[PDB]
PDB file of C-alpha atoms in Angstrom:
ATOM      1  CA  UNK S   1     -14.184  -1.184  -1.828  1.00 36.18           C
ATOM      2  CA  UNK S   2     -14.003  -4.695  -0.374  1.00 34.61           C
ATOM      3  CA  UNK S   3     -10.943  -6.902  -0.861  1.00 33.69           C
ATOM      4  CA  UNK S   4     -12.143  -9.988  -2.731  1.00 31.03           C
ATOM      5  CA  UNK S   5      -8.974 -12.035  -2.246  1.00 30.84           C
ATOM      6  CA  UNK S   6      -5.173 -12.015  -2.399  1.00 26.17           C
ATOM      7  CA  UNK S   7      -3.124 -13.851  -5.024  1.00 27.29           C
ATOM      8  CA  UNK S   8       0.573 -14.340  -5.772  1.00 30.67           C
ATOM      9  CA  UNK S   9       0.544 -14.645  -9.563  1.00 28.59           C
ATOM     10  CA  UNK S  10      -0.446 -12.585 -12.632  1.00 28.56           C
ATOM     11  CA  UNK S  11      -1.937 -15.477 -14.602  1.00 30.27           C
ATOM     12  CA  UNK S  12      -4.323 -16.242 -11.740  1.00 30.34           C
ATOM     13  CA  UNK S  13      -5.127 -12.643 -10.812  1.00 30.13           C
ATOM     14  CA  UNK S  14      -5.809 -11.630 -14.415  1.00 30.03           C
ATOM     15  CA  UNK S  15      -7.638 -14.880 -15.157  1.00 33.38           C
ATOM     16  CA  UNK S  16      -9.904 -14.314 -12.155  1.00 33.08           C
ATOM     17  CA  UNK S  17     -10.827 -10.710 -12.950  1.00 35.82           C
ATOM     18  CA  UNK S  18     -11.120 -11.863 -16.561  1.00 35.96           C
ATOM     19  CA  UNK S  19     -13.809 -14.519 -16.133  1.00 38.60           C
ATOM     20  CA  UNK S  20     -15.441 -12.202 -13.597  1.00 39.15           C
ATOM     21  CA  UNK S  21     -15.568  -9.163 -15.881  1.00 39.08           C
ATOM     22  CA  UNK S  22     -16.974 -11.202 -18.767  1.00 41.62           C
ATOM     23  CA  UNK S  23     -19.566 -12.568 -16.341  1.00 40.74           C
ATOM     24  CA  UNK S  24     -20.823  -9.097 -15.477  1.00 40.29           C
ATOM     25  CA  UNK S  25     -18.580  -8.496 -12.473  1.00 37.70           C
ATOM     26  CA  UNK S  26     -15.816  -5.889 -12.586  1.00 37.80           C
ATOM     27  CA  UNK S  27     -12.738  -6.582 -10.462  1.00 38.79           C
ATOM     28  CA  UNK S  28      -9.430  -4.857  -9.722  1.00 39.11           C
ATOM     29  CA  UNK S  29      -5.910  -6.221  -9.261  1.00 40.50           C
ATOM     30  CA  UNK S  30      -2.896  -4.726  -7.489  1.00 37.25           C
ATOM     31  CA  UNK S  31       0.509  -5.993  -8.614  1.00 37.55           C
ATOM     32  CA  UNK S  32       3.204  -5.074  -6.092  1.00 39.81           C
ATOM     33  CA  UNK S  33       6.675  -4.051  -7.269  1.00 38.86           C
ATOM     34  CA  UNK S  34       9.788  -3.783  -5.100  1.00 39.64           C
ATOM     35  CA  UNK S  35      13.434  -4.748  -5.596  1.00 39.40           C
ATOM     36  CA  UNK S  36      15.197  -5.469  -2.304  1.00 39.12           C
ATOM     37  CA  UNK S  37      18.998  -5.478  -2.452  1.00 39.26           C
ATOM     38  CA  UNK S  38      20.758  -7.857  -0.064  1.00 38.35           C
ATOM     39  CA  UNK S  39      24.438  -8.772   0.239  1.00 35.85           C
ATOM     40  CA  UNK S  40      26.075 -11.940   1.560  1.00 36.29           C
ATOM     41  CA  UNK S  41      29.594 -10.589   2.060  1.00 37.25           C
ATOM     42  CA  UNK S  42      29.266  -8.454   5.192  1.00 33.98           C
ATOM     43  CA  UNK S  43      32.895  -7.396   4.759  1.00 33.90           C
ATOM     44  CA  UNK S  44      31.892  -5.948   1.388  1.00 33.20           C
ATOM     45  CA  UNK S  45      28.687  -4.494   2.833  1.00 34.24           C
ATOM     46  CA  UNK S  46      30.705  -1.382   3.677  1.00 33.10           C
ATOM     47  CA  UNK S  47      32.070  -0.925   0.156  1.00 33.51           C
ATOM     48  CA  UNK S  48      28.663  -1.394  -1.471  1.00 34.72           C
ATOM     49  CA  UNK S  49      27.078   0.914   1.103  1.00 36.97           C
ATOM     50  CA  UNK S  50      29.420   3.793   0.269  1.00 37.85           C
ATOM     51  CA  UNK S  51      29.440   3.293  -3.502  1.00 37.73           C
ATOM     52  CA  UNK S  52      25.662   2.844  -3.458  1.00 38.43           C
ATOM     53  CA  UNK S  53      25.026   6.097  -1.591  1.00 37.97           C
ATOM     54  CA  UNK S  54      27.388   7.796  -4.039  1.00 39.40           C
ATOM     55  CA  UNK S  55      25.522   6.247  -6.971  1.00 38.00           C
ATOM     56  CA  UNK S  56      22.026   7.064  -5.707  1.00 37.74           C
ATOM     57  CA  UNK S  57      22.900  10.761  -5.893  1.00 38.13           C
ATOM     58  CA  UNK S  58      24.033  10.148  -9.472  1.00 39.81           C
ATOM     59  CA  UNK S  59      20.760   9.666 -11.396  1.00 40.65           C
ATOM     60  CA  UNK S  60      21.965   8.670 -14.863  1.00 39.40           C
ATOM     61  CA  UNK S  61      22.694   4.946 -15.121  1.00 42.33           C
ATOM     62  CA  UNK S  62      20.712   3.348 -12.294  1.00 42.28           C
ATOM     63  CA  UNK S  63      17.699   5.255 -13.618  1.00 43.71           C
TER      64      UNK S  63
ATOM     65  CA  UNK M   1      23.180 -11.816   4.708  1.00 42.63           C
ATOM     66  CA  UNK M   2      22.914  -8.057   5.222  1.00 40.84           C
ATOM     67  CA  UNK M   3      20.298  -5.999   3.381  1.00 37.44           C
ATOM     68  CA  UNK M   4      22.208  -3.427   1.333  1.00 34.88           C
ATOM     69  CA  UNK M   5      19.190  -1.324   0.371  1.00 32.79           C
ATOM     70  CA  UNK M   6      15.683  -1.293  -1.101  1.00 30.36           C
ATOM     71  CA  UNK M   7      14.622  -0.112  -4.557  1.00 31.56           C
ATOM     72  CA  UNK M   8      11.318   0.261  -6.403  1.00 31.95           C
ATOM     73  CA  UNK M   9      12.448  -0.519  -9.951  1.00 27.42           C
ATOM     74  CA  UNK M  10      14.088  -3.367 -11.911  1.00 30.78           C
ATOM     75  CA  UNK M  11      16.372  -1.163 -14.006  1.00 28.99           C
ATOM     76  CA  UNK M  12      17.929   0.365 -10.890  1.00 26.10           C
ATOM     77  CA  UNK M  13      18.171  -2.896  -8.949  1.00 25.02           C
ATOM     78  CA  UNK M  14      19.802  -4.752 -11.840  1.00 24.60           C
ATOM     79  CA  UNK M  15      22.025  -1.804 -12.755  1.00 28.64           C
ATOM     80  CA  UNK M  16      23.211  -1.559  -9.149  1.00 27.55           C
ATOM     81  CA  UNK M  17      24.050  -5.243  -8.702  1.00 29.16           C
ATOM     82  CA  UNK M  18      25.563  -5.023 -12.184  1.00 31.77           C
ATOM     83  CA  UNK M  19      28.211  -2.383 -11.492  1.00 35.60           C
ATOM     84  CA  UNK M  20      28.731  -4.048  -8.113  1.00 38.76           C
ATOM     85  CA  UNK M  21      29.261  -7.536  -9.535  1.00 37.88           C
ATOM     86  CA  UNK M  22      31.712  -6.337 -12.186  1.00 37.41           C
ATOM     87  CA  UNK M  23      33.597  -4.588  -9.385  1.00 40.72           C
ATOM     88  CA  UNK M  24      34.103  -7.830  -7.484  1.00 39.34           C
ATOM     89  CA  UNK M  25      31.021  -7.573  -5.282  1.00 40.53           C
ATOM     90  CA  UNK M  26      28.131  -9.998  -5.758  1.00 38.74           C
ATOM     91  CA  UNK M  27      24.665  -8.696  -4.887  1.00 38.06           C
ATOM     92  CA  UNK M  28      21.135 -10.109  -4.813  1.00 33.94           C
ATOM     93  CA  UNK M  29      17.776  -8.597  -5.753  1.00 32.40           C
ATOM     94  CA  UNK M  30      14.270  -9.522  -4.606  1.00 30.11           C
ATOM     95  CA  UNK M  31      11.437  -8.527  -6.941  1.00 32.18           C
ATOM     96  CA  UNK M  32       8.255  -8.590  -4.857  1.00 35.64           C
ATOM     97  CA  UNK M  33       5.201 -10.116  -6.536  1.00 35.96           C
ATOM     98  CA  UNK M  34       1.666  -9.941  -5.140  1.00 33.95           C
ATOM     99  CA  UNK M  35      -1.691  -9.522  -6.878  1.00 36.30           C
ATOM    100  CA  UNK M  36      -4.380  -8.172  -4.552  1.00 36.78           C
ATOM    101  CA  UNK M  37      -7.960  -8.566  -5.776  1.00 36.68           C
ATOM    102  CA  UNK M  38     -10.393  -5.869  -4.650  1.00 38.14           C
ATOM    103  CA  UNK M  39     -14.011  -5.216  -5.624  1.00 35.24           C
ATOM    104  CA  UNK M  40     -16.049  -2.005  -5.603  1.00 32.43           C
ATOM    105  CA  UNK M  41     -19.513  -3.560  -5.831  1.00 29.74           C
ATOM    106  CA  UNK M  42     -20.083  -4.775  -2.271  1.00 29.94           C
ATOM    107  CA  UNK M  43     -23.380  -6.310  -3.389  1.00 28.20           C
ATOM    108  CA  UNK M  44     -21.376  -8.418  -5.841  1.00 28.82           C
ATOM    109  CA  UNK M  45     -18.710  -9.106  -3.218  1.00 27.27           C
ATOM    110  CA  UNK M  46     -20.861 -12.082  -2.226  1.00 26.29           C
ATOM    111  CA  UNK M  47     -21.437 -13.702  -5.620  1.00 24.63           C
ATOM    112  CA  UNK M  48     -17.737 -13.187  -6.341  1.00 23.51           C
ATOM    113  CA  UNK M  49     -16.605 -14.582  -2.989  1.00 26.83           C
ATOM    114  CA  UNK M  50     -18.468 -17.828  -3.669  1.00 29.26           C
ATOM    115  CA  UNK M  51     -17.549 -18.215  -7.340  1.00 28.95           C
ATOM    116  CA  UNK M  52     -13.949 -17.272  -6.556  1.00 28.62           C
ATOM    117  CA  UNK M  53     -13.654 -19.761  -3.695  1.00 29.60           C
ATOM    118  CA  UNK M  54     -15.032 -22.414  -6.045  1.00 27.88           C
ATOM    119  CA  UNK M  55     -12.585 -21.421  -8.784  1.00 27.44           C
ATOM    120  CA  UNK M  56      -9.524 -21.330  -6.525  1.00 27.48           C
ATOM    121  CA  UNK M  57     -10.049 -25.010  -5.719  1.00 29.55           C
ATOM    122  CA  UNK M  58     -10.328 -25.614  -9.464  1.00 34.66           C
ATOM    123  CA  UNK M  59      -6.725 -25.300 -10.716  1.00 37.96           C
ATOM    124  CA  UNK M  60      -7.122 -25.474 -14.495  1.00 40.53           C
ATOM    125  CA  UNK M  61      -7.523 -22.015 -16.023  1.00 40.94           C
ATOM    126  CA  UNK M  62      -6.474 -19.575 -13.299  1.00 41.56           C
ATOM    127  CA  UNK M  63      -3.212 -21.531 -13.205  1.00 40.09           C
TER     128      UNK M  63
END
């Protein structure tokens, strides 16, 4: 497996592998997925931290 | 800005910032987006590398 190239968009990625597959060349795409949570109110960082940890152990809504 | 935490799903991320925002705490989420193109046919890795490089500079369809 040799990395052909790296893209930052689905339309492009898909389009590429699309015209390539129809041309007789099979390609693969890897769409990353990660949701980073950041706060601006440091003072509230503590509140969110606690509540968050207490929510993470409560798999019902977040999930 | 202090990173509160990191998640691997939209539902969770949104849900979290949701219950946090309605509680008087504003939060932010960062949904990573990256499409990595990899090939299995090394022999074709060449023909693809050229065609791809020529297509990348041709913003019309891929875009």
